[PDB]
Design a protein around this nucleic acid. Structure first.
Ligand SMILES: [Mg+2]
Ligand SMILES: [Mg+2]
Ligand SMILES: [Mg+2]
Ligand SMILES: [Mg+2]
Ligand SMILES: [Mg+2]
Ligand SMILES: [Mg+2]
Ligand SMILES: [Mg+2]
Ligand SMILES: [Mg+2]
Ligand SMILES: [Mg+2]
Ligand SMILES: [Mg+2]
Ligand SMILES: [Mg+2]
Ligand SMILES: [Mg+2]
Ligand SMILES: [Mg+2]
Ligand SMILES: [Mg+2]
Ligand SMILES: [Mg+2]
Ligand SMILES: [Mg+2]
Ligand SMILES: [Mg+2]
Ligand SMILES: [Mg+2]
Ligand SMILES: [Mg+2]
Ligand SMILES: [Mg+2]
Ligand SMILES: [Mg+2]
Ligand SMILES: [Mg+2]
Ligand SMILES: [Mg+2]
Ligand SMILES: [Mg+2]
Ligand SMILES: [Mg+2]
Ligand SMILES: [Mg+2]
Ligand SMILES: [Mg+2]
Ligand SMILES: [Mg+2]
Ligand SMILES: [Mg+2]
Ligand SMILES: [Mg+2]
Ligand SMILES: [Mg+2]
Ligand SMILES: [Mg+2]
Ligand SMILES: [Mg+2]
Ligand SMILES: [Mg+2]
Ligand SMILES: [Mg+2]
Ligand SMILES: [Mg+2]
Ligand SMILES: [Mg+2]
Ligand SMILES: [Mg+2]
Ligand SMILES: [Mg+2]
Ligand SMILES: [Mg+2]
Ligand SMILES: [Mg+2]
Ligand SMILES: [Mg+2]
Ligand SMILES: [Mg+2]
Ligand SMILES: [Mg+2]
Ligand SMILES: [Mg+2]
Ligand SMILES: [Mg+2]
Ligand SMILES: [Mg+2]
Ligand SMILES: [Mg+2]
Ligand SMILES: [Mg+2]
Ligand SMILES: [Mg+2]
Ligand SMILES: [Mg+2]
Ligand SMILES: [Mg+2]
Ligand SMILES: [Mg+2]
Ligand SMILES: [Mg+2]
Ligand SMILES: [Mg+2]
Ligand SMILES: [Mg+2]
Ligand SMILES: [Mg+2]
Ligand SMILES: [Mg+2]
Ligand SMILES: [Mg+2]
Ligand SMILES: [Mg+2]
Ligand SMILES: [Mg+2]
Ligand SMILES: [Mg+2]
Ligand SMILES: [Mg+2]
Ligand SMILES: [Mg+2]
Ligand SMILES: [Mg+2]
Ligand SMILES: [Mg+2]
Ligand SMILES: [Mg+2]
Ligand SMILES: [Mg+2]
Ligand SMILES: [Mg+2]
Ligand SMILES: [Mg+2]
Ligand SMILES: [Mg+2]
Ligand SMILES: [Mg+2]
Ligand SMILES: [Mg+2]
Ligand SMILES: [Mg+2]
Ligand SMILES: [Mg+2]
Ligand SMILES: [Mg+2]
Ligand SMILES: [Mg+2]
Ligand SMILES: [Mg+2]
Ligand SMILES: [Mg+2]
Ligand SMILES: [Mg+2]
Ligand SMILES: [Mg+2]
Ligand SMILES: [Mg+2]
Ligand SMILES: [Mg+2]
Ligand SMILES: [Mg+2]
Ligand SMILES: [Mg+2]
Ligand SMILES: [Mg+2]
Ligand SMILES: [Mg+2]
Ligand SMILES: [Mg+2]
Ligand SMILES: [Mg+2]
Ligand SMILES: [Mg+2]
Ligand SMILES: [Mg+2]
Ligand SMILES: [Mg+2]
Ligand SMILES: [Mg+2]
Ligand SMILES: [Mg+2]
Ligand SMILES: [Mg+2]
Ligand SMILES: [Mg+2]
Ligand SMILES: [Mg+2]
Ligand SMILES: [Mg+2]
Ligand SMILES: [Mg+2]
Ligand SMILES: [Mg+2]
Ligand SMILES: [Mg+2]
Ligand SMILES: [Mg+2]
Ligand SMILES: [Mg+2]
Ligand SMILES: [Mg+2]
Ligand SMILES: [Mg+2]
Ligand SMILES: [Mg+2]
Ligand SMILES: [Mg+2]
Ligand SMILES: [Mg+2]
Lengths: 197, 111, 156, 106, 127, 122
RNA sequence: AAUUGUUGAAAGGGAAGGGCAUUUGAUCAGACA
RNA sequence: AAUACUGCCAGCUGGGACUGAGGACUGCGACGUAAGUCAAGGAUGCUGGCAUAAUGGUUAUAUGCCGCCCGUCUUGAAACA
RNA sequence: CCCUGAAAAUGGAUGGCGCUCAAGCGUGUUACCUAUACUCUACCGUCAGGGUUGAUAUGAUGCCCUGACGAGUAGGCAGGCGUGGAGGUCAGUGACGAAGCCUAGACCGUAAGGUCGGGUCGAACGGCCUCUAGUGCAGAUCUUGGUGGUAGUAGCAAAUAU
RNA sequence: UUGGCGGAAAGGCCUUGGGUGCUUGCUGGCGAAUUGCAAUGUCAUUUUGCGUGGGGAUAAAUCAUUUGUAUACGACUUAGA
């Protein structure tokens, strides 16, 4: 439907975002996910910290290099959830994964692009209220992810340059909204009114 | 098995559509009324409906009339079975046993 | 010999076909196809062209016209199944169209008869097109699907 | 003007398959904006084309088309099964495909 | 010019090659049936090669017809060639592989003048 | 035929670590090289352009000799003689063009667009 | 024949080879009239 | 009174898919005042494209899914037989 | 239902990812996906039941109609394929090229196999009805011969020395 | 072309001024056929290659030799107009 779909990761439940992102991929849809550090996980922080440590202890005994690899960054945590839902050793699986990019914060290009949201993985719509959950950047930091402060710093700055963007924009739609008002009551206008516009 | 009470409508549409005759074995399609009279005219019964009448009413010659009919070969129910698992009794939410006049909806989908 | 030779040869006498039972009965048209309806040509040379429906020809085709002065389509044959009949409609009750048969379009540049026949039909049409505003422009636009158009949804 | 499309956009999903055996004789087509079975019974019978490019020119073009037809609906979400003059090449899984408007009935 | 025949349908055009003919040189492709007790092929496990069987048998009506529509007949000399004199829409003559250069020009020419088809007409031709 | 051979910087020239200095092979090849030079001298071939165009080695019949192994045993101790052939050739530039002409064949709908593209425009 | 050199073509992210299917490349029969 | 529900109609009717075996006639019927006609013991009519590597066969490669070494003895073998 | 009771050795398995008003547990209603099964059709074979010697063309173990059926080790039987030699025959093929060998070239058969093209080749050889056996190989730590990977590797260092 | 912003991967965003094309805002003149009743009917963007001429630029690494802060061999670290 669109060449690329930028997903604001914030507020989505990991495996559910991973699951729709996975299918989209395999159906030809390019996808980049942003703000992976504001991702959510059901269950409280401690459970998912433990869970991560369970994962953390598995490795090839005779050579901890060949064994499993434990990536700390919230994007890569997410990628792991996601690659688990793709036949990633097939060619078609590698095909589909190249159509995917995960990101902490919202870096260039995609910060000027509009990002969308996935209702069926939105935590605020999914989780029963009163349930406990986990933020991915908090989880990632407790297991050796370095860059939580640098990301929040760059994001706070980016949000500042964006609040201006919006502000200028809302100011201009006030003109357009005012323009369209005087054009209302005219002949074009009541005709379009008729045709549903 | 699943069985029940056939209605005239489903006996009619069974004989008409998938009704065949054992004639020197040779499972013969019923297609013409003269096929029947040749083999069942002995006992009355000289039309395809003369058959259905003998069947549905259980006449004096239901043995020879009913045996003249080859077993009916039905397909699987066209909308499915309705139950999740088949090999329980109808009463217990499966398909087998005597489901009485509910046999007609079953059979009509299998025809 | 190198090969023996068969005991039986199949006779080369060629049989004749059984007497088939297939009458060519006439083709009834879908109710949306009435003369003077605006079609959308879905495929072929003039694809996406909006065009006026005139006569149902004996070979099952449909007689259309641009009109040629509106959008460049001539009096032409078109297959009823490669067409969307719209709901918009001019009155064709002053168009000859009788002249036009299958043999008319035998293959056998443009015959002067056709160039004229085009003008006589067209003039009648235009005179009626002009009766509803913007219709003449519509008939010179091409139809295309825009983003979001859902054919199984759109009233035509 | 800018648009010219006379088809509905499509996507070649999978072959028809079980868990562990596919059937290359039936492709499964995802039609843009068709989301239920009832919506997709409109497209039954429409012709599909998978257009693709090639290096060897042929009949004076470097562009080739495999033609098919929607034949039946699939599942509950407006997926649709379709068959082609030659099965689609399984690399096409996730490629774009063109569902036309003919044989029309409007 | 062959007699009319129903669309020739072949049923399994892929050569039935012997199991493991692809594996050891010693094992020729010529079909051989597996007699082993565990052999996946004999047991018909899903994924392995298929085996000859009578279901594959060609339609009686079109069996032995090569493309054109003519059952082929091996021809060694004119008298052999002439046996197809009343049968040109049913049989094509194939010249035997050992017929000499000159002798094939006689058969070809006689075949031409009789309306009999020939399947390998460029053999030993003096081009 | 290079496994467990040593490494040398001299392989770098060729992207290689394992290279060697087989003097009896060299001395035999340049022997036959020399002969092909002469043969082209007498042919009148412009020696200034000669390049080695085909040079192949495969194996002459082996030569049995035997050595003596522990507990009273015998083992083959063979030679691996070779068959060498090479041909030099006067290098030469270009090749010119010239080929088919590509039979273009297009349906009636496919010549109409062509004719109209020129009827319409250039 | 195993096996080897050269030349040509092609594939190769912890073997190779096989089945059904199709794209692409190469190659070829027959049939039109 | 209506509606639902369940059942019936030898009531009407649209969209889609696969198939077209057979090769004179012969049968059982149907429509017709009639002559004739027919959807009644298996596809015909009309139009177009190419006449070619277009379709098809072979082959090599890629891709989806699938595929453990054969032989043997054995209750049981891919077996660390 | 959940928690405690609940301790093992390479890292690790509700099949995996992951899931928390579930993608968990109980239970109900629908729709949906797909077996070599089921229904209909085409073809192949097997078995069965019919019909047909009437000349003046070509199979009577034939030809025509019809129905049903088709898993298989050990094992039985059947009908076929291929080799060496023998009787008969085709007044068969051949130095204007027999036999053989090569060939991701063509065709026939379900298959054993059969046929052809080309290339190499150089003196013989085949079809059909019969007869006959020292008549078909992947195996037997099979027999004899030939050849690989190993591998330019182990190694070529005792006896003082050039 | 004026001024300004953007380093998270900025490599893009904003603003000034003239030049020029288009304008379906509205009203006109001309054209379209025969591509024959459909046959994607070809309008994307990848990399490379060959000559033409409008700017711009004129190295190094390796073998060999050598050091010994290094070394089984490669490799490492030095030196040499
Ligand atoms: Mg895919
Ligand atoms: Mg894609
Ligand atoms: Mg590992
Ligand atoms: Mg994974
Ligand atoms: Mg993919
Ligand atoms: Mg909620
Ligand atoms: Mg339903
Ligand atoms: Mg269904
Ligand atoms: Mg069911
Ligand atoms: Mg169940
Ligand atoms: Mg049914
Ligand atoms: Mg008739
Ligand atoms: Mg009608
Ligand atoms: Mg109607
Ligand atoms: Mg116009
Ligand atoms: Mg797939
Ligand atoms: Mg499926
Ligand atoms: Mg196909
Ligand atoms: Mg794929
Ligand atoms: Mg075959
Ligand atoms: Mg065997
Ligand atoms: Mg096995
Ligand atoms: Mg066993
Ligand atoms: Mg001769
Ligand atoms: Mg020859
Ligand atoms: Mg080696
Ligand atoms: Mg070494
Ligand atoms: Mg080594
Ligand atoms: Mg060593
Ligand atoms: Mg090397
Ligand atoms: Mg020794
Ligand atoms: Mg000794
Ligand atoms: Mg050796
Ligand atoms: Mg044009
Ligand atoms: Mg033009
Ligand atoms: Mg590896
Ligand atoms: Mg293949
Ligand atoms: Mg002809
Ligand atoms: Mg009701
Ligand atoms: Mg009814
Ligand atoms: Mg027919
Ligand atoms: Mg037929
Ligand atoms: Mg009457
Ligand atoms: Mg009729
Ligand atoms: Mg061709
Ligand atoms: Mg041509
Ligand atoms: Mg082809
Ligand atoms: Mg040809
Ligand atoms: Mg062509
Ligand atoms: Mg074609
Ligand atoms: Mg190749
Ligand atoms: Mg292959
Ligand atoms: Mg597998
Ligand atoms: Mg084996
Ligand atoms: Mg035991
Ligand atoms: Mg046993
Ligand atoms: Mg066991
Ligand atoms: Mg075994
Ligand atoms: Mg074991
Ligand atoms: Mg509970
Ligand atoms: Mg372990
Ligand atoms: Mg558990
Ligand atoms: Mg779950
Ligand atoms: Mg599960
Ligand atoms: Mg539940
Ligand atoms: Mg329902
Ligand atoms: Mg099954
Ligand atoms: Mg089956
Ligand atoms: Mg059946
Ligand atoms: Mg008999
Ligand atoms: Mg059996
Ligand atoms: Mg046999
Ligand atoms: Mg024999
Ligand atoms: Mg013999
Ligand atoms: Mg020989
Ligand atoms: Mg060769
Ligand atoms: Mg070959
Ligand atoms: Mg041939
Ligand atoms: Mg072959
Ligand atoms: Mg043949
Ligand atoms: Mg040959
Ligand atoms: Mg030859
Ligand atoms: Mg020879
Ligand atoms: Mg001699
Ligand atoms: Mg003989
Ligand atoms: Mg014998
Ligand atoms: Mg013996
Ligand atoms: Mg064997
Ligand atoms: Mg054998
Ligand atoms: Mg032998
Ligand atoms: Mg052997
Ligand atoms: Mg062996
Ligand atoms: Mg054996
Ligand atoms: Mg051996
Ligand atoms: Mg060796
Ligand atoms: Mg040496
Ligand atoms: Mg050594
Ligand atoms: Mg020693
Ligand atoms: Mg010494
Ligand atoms: Mg001394
Ligand atoms: Mg930066
Ligand atoms: Mg980026
Ligand atoms: Mg930058
Ligand atoms: Mg301007
Ligand atoms: Mg415009
Ligand atoms: Mg174009
Ligand atoms: Mg230059
Ligand atoms: Mg100097």
């Amino acid at each position: 439907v669109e060449p690329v779909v930028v997903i604001d990761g914030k507020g989505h439940l990991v495996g559910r975002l991973a699951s729709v992102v996975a299918k989209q991929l395999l159906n030809g849809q390019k996808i980049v996910v942003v703000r992976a550090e504001e991702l959510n996980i059901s269950g409280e922080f401690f459970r998912n910290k433990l869970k991560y440590h369970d994962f953390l202890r598995k490795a090839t005994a005779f050579n901890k290099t060949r064994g499993p690899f434990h990536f700390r960054a919230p994007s890569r945590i997410f990628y792991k959830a996601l690659r688990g839902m793709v036949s990633h050793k097939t060619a078609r699986g590698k095909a589909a994964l190249e159509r995917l990019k995960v990101f902490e914060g919202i870096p260039p290009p995609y910060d000027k692009k509009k990002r969308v949201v996935v209702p069926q993985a939105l935590r605020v719509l999914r989780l029963k209220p009163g349930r406990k959950y986990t933020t991915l950047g908090k989880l990632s930091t407790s297991v050796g992810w370095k860059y939580e402060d640098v990301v929040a710093k760059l994001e706070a700055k980016r949000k500042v340059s964006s609040a201006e963007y919006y502000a200028k924009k809302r100011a201009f739609t006030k003109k357009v909204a005012s323009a369209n008002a005087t054009a209302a009551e005219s002949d074009v206008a009541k005709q379009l009114a008729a045709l549903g516009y | 098995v699943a069985y029940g009470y056939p209605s005239y409508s489903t006996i009619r549409q069974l004989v008409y559509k998938r009704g065949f005759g054992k004639i020197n074995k040779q499972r013969v399609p019923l297609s013409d009324n003269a096929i029947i009279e040749a083999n069942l005219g002995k006992y009355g019964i000289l039309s395809i409906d003369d058959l259905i009448h003998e069947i549905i009413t259980v006449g004096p010659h239901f043995k020879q009339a009913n045996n003249f009919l080859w077993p009916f070969k039905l397909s699987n129910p066209s909308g499915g079975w309705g139950v999740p698992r088949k090999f329980k009794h109808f009463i217990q939410g499966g398909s087998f046993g005597n489901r009485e006049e509910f046999i007609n909806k079953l059979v009509k989908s299998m025809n | 010999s190198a090969q023996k030779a068969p005991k039986w040869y199949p006779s080369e006498d060629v049989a004749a076909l059984k007497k088939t039972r297939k009458a060519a009965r006439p083709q009834k048209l879908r109710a949306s196809l009435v003369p003077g309806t605006v079609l959308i040509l879905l495929a072929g040379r003039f694809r996406g062209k909006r065009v006026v429906y005139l006569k149902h020809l004996e070979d099952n085709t449909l007689l259309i016209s641009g009109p040629f002065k509106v959008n460049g389509v001539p009096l032409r044959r078109v297959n009823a199944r490669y067409v969307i009949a719209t709901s918009t409609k001019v009155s064709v009750e002053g168009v000859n169209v009788e002249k036009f048969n299958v043999e008319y379009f035998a293959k056998e540049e443009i015959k002067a008869e056709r160039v004229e026949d085009q003008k006589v039909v067209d003039k009648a049409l235009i005179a009626e097109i002009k009766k509803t505003p913007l219709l003449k422009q519509y008939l010179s636009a091409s139809f295309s699907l825009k983003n979001g158009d859902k054919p199984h949804m759109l009233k035509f | 003007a800018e648009s010219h499309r006379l088809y509905v956009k499509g996507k070649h999903l999978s072959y028809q398959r079980s868990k562990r055996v596919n059937n290359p004789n039936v492709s499964l087509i995802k039609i843009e904006g068709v989301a239920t079975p009832q919506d997709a019974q409109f497209y039954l019978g429409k012709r599909i084309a998978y257009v693709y490019r090639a290096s060897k020119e042929v009949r004076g073009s470097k562009i080739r088309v495999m033609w098919g037809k929607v034949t039946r609906t699939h599942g509950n979400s407006g997926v649709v099964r379709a068959t082609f003059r030659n099965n689609l090449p399984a690399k096409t899984f996730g490629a774009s495909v063109r569902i036309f408007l003919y044989p029309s009935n409007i | 010019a062959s007699l009319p025949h129903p669309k020739i349908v072949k049923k399994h055009t892929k050569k039935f090659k012997r199991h493991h003919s692809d594996r050891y040189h010693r094992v020729a492709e010529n079909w051989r049936k597996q007699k082993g007790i565990d052999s996946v092929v004999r047991r018909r496990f899903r994924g392995n090669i298929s085996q000859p069987k009578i279901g594959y048998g060609s339609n009686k009506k079109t069996k032995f017809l090569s493309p054109s529509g003519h059952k082929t007949f091996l021809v060694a000399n004119v008298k052999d060639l002439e046996t197809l004199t009343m049968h040109t829409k049913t049989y094509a003559a194939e010249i035997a592989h050992n017929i000499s250069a000159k002798n094939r020009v006689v058969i070809l020419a006689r075949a031409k003048a009789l309306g009999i088809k020939v399947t390998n007409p460029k053999g030993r031709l003096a081009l | 035929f290079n496994s467990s051979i040593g490494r040398t910087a001299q392989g770098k020239e060729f992207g290689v670590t394992k290279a060697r200095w087989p003097a009896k092979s060299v001395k035999f090849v340049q022997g036959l090289l020399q002969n092909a030079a002469a043969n082209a001298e007498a042919k009148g071939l412009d020696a200034t352009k000669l390049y080695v165009s085909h040079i192949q080695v495969n194996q002459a019949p082996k030569q049995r000799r035997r050595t003596y192994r522990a507990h009273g045993r015998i083992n083959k101790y063979e030679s691996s003689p070779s068959h060498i052939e090479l041909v030099v050739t006067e290098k030469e530039e270009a090749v010119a063009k010239a080929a088919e002409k590509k039979v273009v064949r297009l349906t009636s709908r496919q010549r109409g667009r062509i004719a109209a593209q020129k009827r319409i425009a250039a």
